[PDB]
């Protein structure tokens, strides 16, 4: 049980503000090469956050939240599973317990979500299937927490178009999350719209990976079962020249199958 190594010059400037709020010891623990210290820092921070009394000044509560979110964000990228899992436990406590306990605003909730969800989505492209599932399940869990659901933030990340050079795992995970949360949250108040969903799905039909294109077809057909006529403007016209692309054939005779 030797002490954590010192922070590098780069880490020092990067974590400058967190050091003032949380102290150098805890930040050094979080940055060091010993996973059990990285884990302990997050669990210690978890204890510290919930022991802060109700009447604590709002600016101290917000600073502490912002410094903690800074550490959660880096720990979501951890190379050891236990540290990754401890960061999710901390993140959940901040959004679901700390914020409502101290009656903090929607801007704080939004800050937690905006700083962590994009980094968490990168972990849904991990090589480990068990890690992809843990990351995806947590995103689904946060998307349905009452305070986060109201902000409509998470659906907006899930409809962002798939990059050309995107991995097979990353693309499949995003599509899986889109389909599952679209069914749970629906259209209107959620942040999903016929507009952004179809825009995403039609764009995915040009992806290099067969399985990505195939899932886009499945989502388009599901949107036709629900919304019928209002999605047709997003697609090309139904005729035999369009049907010389094999995917659009499947879609349009798919539409024909769904009707009489």
Numbering used by the authors: 414 to 673
Question: Anything the authors wrote about it?
Answer:
To this end, we purified recombinant human Cep104 TOG and subjected it to size-exclusion chromatography coupled with multi-angle light scattering (SEC-MALS) in the presence or absence of tubulin. The results shown in Figure 1D and Table 1 demonstrate that Cep104 TOG is indeed a tubulin-binding domain and suggest a probable 1:1 complex between both proteins. To gain a structural insight into the Cep104-tubulin interaction, we determined the high-resolution structure of the TOG domain to a resolution of 2.3 Å by X-ray crystallography. Characteristic for TOG domains, the Cep104 TOG structure consists of six HEAT-like repeats A–F and globally superposes well with other known TOG structures (root-mean-square deviation [rmsd] 3–3.5 Å, Figure S2C). Repeats A–C and E of the Cep104 TOG domain are canonical, whereas repeats D and F are partly distorted. A structure comparison of Cep104 TOG with the TOG domains from XMAP215 and CLASP proteins shows that the conformation of the loops that define their tubulin-binding interface is more conserved than those of the loops found on the opposite side. Furthermore, the residues on that side of the Cep104 TOG domain are highly conserved across different species. Structure superposition of the human Cep104 TOG domain with the Stu2 TOG1 domain in complex with tubulin suggest that key residues implicated in the Stu2-tubulin interaction (Ayaz et al., 2012) are conserved, such as the W448, V493, and R626 residues. To test whether these residues are indeed crucial for tubulin binding, we introduced point mutations in Cep104 TOG, produced the corresponding recombinant proteins, and subjected them to SEC-MALS in the presence or absence of tubulin. The results shown in Figure 1D and Table 1 demonstrate that these mutants are indeed severely (V493D and R626A) or mildly (W448A) impaired in their ability to interact with tubulin. Thus, the Cep104 TOG domain engages tubulin in a similar way to the Stu2 TOG1 domain. Tubulin-binding TOG domains, e.g., in the XMAP215 family of MAPs, act to stabilize microtubules through facilitating tubulin addition to microtubule ends, and we speculate that the TOG domain in Cep104 has an analogous role.
